[PDB]
Amino acid sequence: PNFSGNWKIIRSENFEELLKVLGVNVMLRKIAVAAASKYAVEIKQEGDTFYIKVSTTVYTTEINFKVGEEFEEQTVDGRPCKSLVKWESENKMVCEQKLLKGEGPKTSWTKELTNDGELIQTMTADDVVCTQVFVRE
Ligand SMILES: *C/C=C(C)/C=C/C=C(C)/C=C/C1=C(C)CCCC1(C)C
């Protein structure tokens, strides 16, 4: 497939519950959920190599990886982790994360290109899954 594009969020579910599992207190949880309303994802994909830029109104960060090659990024609540992406199917990838320091919930994410031109991203902490849906700008 080709994940490349400028993606704008249209739907986000269970994000507060994910942040709660991660220990974020309620006021900052509500503020974070609001910020996810302007969540934008820019993807450049060349074969198995991905460049991903995640941005909100006031913050931007870049994730760079090749499928099957360990890299370092951060968890959803900002702790540094070692990550490894693999394909699950033609159009879906899954990333497993390992904390560099300390303990914490088991975290992962996925990206999927649907047949209807949507990008579905999920973020997981233990039993709670946040699902977010994007369309091309
Ligand atoms: C492939 C896509 C990835 C790894 C995206 C990761 C996105 C995040 C860790 C987003 C985090 C956010 C917050 C911590 C609060 C504000 C809203 C978000 C969703 C941008």
Contact 70, 83 (CB under 8 A): yes
Return the DSSP state at 137.
-
Return the DSSP state at 37.
G
Radius of gyration of the chain, Cα coordinates, nearest whole angstrom:
14
Structural domain that includes position 112? 1-137
* Residue indicated by tokens 């904390």: 99
In 3D space, the residue among 135, 133, 136, 129 whose CA is nearest the CA of residue 14 turns out to be 129
In 3D space, the residue among 124, 132, 119, 123 whose CA is nearest the CA of residue 92 turns out to be 119
Say how many domains are in the chain: 1
Alpha-carbon distance values, 45 to 32, 70, 96 (Å): 28, 17, 19
- Dist. CA 27–CA 35, nearest whole Å: 13
Alpha-carbon distance values, 36 to 6, 9, 32, 71, 76 (Å): 16, 8, 6, 25, 12
Of ligand 1's atoms, which has the minimum distance to the CA of residue 111?
1
Contact 58, 39 (CB under 8 A): no
- Dist. CA 11–CA 79, nearest whole Å: 25
- Dist. CA 75–CA 101, nearest whole Å: 12
For residue 57, give the 3-state DSSP assignment. coil
Return the DSSP state at 33.
H
**Residues near ligand 1 with C-beta < 6 Å?**
32, 35-36, 39, 52, 54, 56, 63, 76, 109, 111, 121
Resolution (A): 1.8
Where would I find the H helices in the chain?
15-21, 26-35
Contact 120, 135 (CB under 8 A): no
Amino acid (1-letter code) at residue 123? M
Alpha-carbon distance values, 23 to 19, 26, 50 (Å): 6, 9, 30
In 3D space, the residue among 11, 110, 99 whose CA is nearest the CA of residue 67 turns out to be 110
* Residue indicated by tokens 């992962």: 108
Which of 15, 30, 56 to mutate for ligand 1's pocket (most ligand atoms within 8 Å of CB)? Answer: 56
For residue 11, give the 3-state DSSP assignment. strand
Which CATH number do you get for residue 39? 2.40.128.20
For residue 84, give the 3-state DSSP assignment. strand
